[PDB]
Amino acid sequence: IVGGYTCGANTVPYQVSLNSGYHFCGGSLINSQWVVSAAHCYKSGIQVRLGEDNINVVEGNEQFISASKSIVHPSYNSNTLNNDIMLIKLKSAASLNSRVASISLPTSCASAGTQCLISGWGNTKSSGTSYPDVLKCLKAPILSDSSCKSAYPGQITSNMFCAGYLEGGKDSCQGDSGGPVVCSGKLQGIVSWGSGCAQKNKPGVYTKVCNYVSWIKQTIASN
Numbered sequence: 001i002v003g004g005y006t007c008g009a010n011t012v013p014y015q016v017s018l019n020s021g022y023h024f025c026g027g028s029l030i031n032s033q034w035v036v037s038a039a040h041c042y043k044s045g046i047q048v049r050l051g052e053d054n055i056n057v058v059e060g061n062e063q064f065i066s067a068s069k070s071i072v073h074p075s076y077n078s079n080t081l082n083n084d085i086m087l088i089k090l091k092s093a094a095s096l097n098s099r100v101a102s103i104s105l106p107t108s109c110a111s112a113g114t115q116c117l118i119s120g121w122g123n124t125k126s127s128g129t130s131y132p133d134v135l136k137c138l139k140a141p142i143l144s145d146s147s148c149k150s151a152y153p154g155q156i157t158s159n160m161f162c163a164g165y166l167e168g169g170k171d172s173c174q175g176d177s178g179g180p181v182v183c184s185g186k187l188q189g190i191v192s193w194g195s196g197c198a199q200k201n202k203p204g205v206y207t208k209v210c211n212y213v214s215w216i217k218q219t220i221a222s223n
């Protein structure tokens with residue numbers, strides 16, 4: 001997260017870190033056994049880390065649970081990043097509490113102008129490289145489809161939305177991939193892609209989660 005703030009320990013209780021020897025992606029806990037992340041975060045050997053603040057220190061509220069199964073969206077295209085969504089099932093159910101909690105799926109799509117919370121352990125610099133170890137947060141509005149398409153000609157599908165600031169300076173970045181965009185207590189987005197981070201007229205692009213609720217529910221119900 002570039003131009004954000006320190007969230008505070010366990011204040012984003014649905015935020016997970018995906019770990020394969022190291023943090024490589026964010027995710028969102030949507031029930032005791034399932035995490036939603038980005039399809040481009042797919043790899044084998046995933047351990048889901050819940051209750052994290054400092055990802056380099058065991059602080060006492062963590063639950064480390066290995067993934068039993070990953071399900072990338074059937075229509076995910078890695079070139080265009082269309083349908084950039086995946087589900088990860090935990091080998092055992094997480095113990096839910098105030099610091100480890102699921103986030104609600106949307107019942108309807110959020111509109112341009114809606115304020116959201118974006119979070120993650122990604123790069124905090126737009127030019128250099130500095131990785132924080134505590135969770136960073138950014139409050140950011142959803143942008144109009146028209147401004148999103150104008151920022152990224154030929155690249156924005158019906159399964160994507162822009163959020164952030166056209167002036168630059170505040171954005172998600174490398175390492176935030178797969179993490180949450182939550183608006184009014186609903187998971188509306190997944191950190192997906194962008195051109196650099198926090199660059200003028202290049203806001204972050206996010207997977208439009210409301211399009212996938214039926215797929216998520218049915219997949220969970222049979223897996």
Ligand SMILES: N[C@H]1CC[C@H](O)CC1
Nearest residue numbers: 172173174193194204
């Ligand atoms: N704003 C996006 C966040 C994820 C990334 O890998 C590229 C920039």
Ligand SMILES: [Ca+2]
Nearest residue numbers: 054057058059
């Ligand atoms: Ca920790």
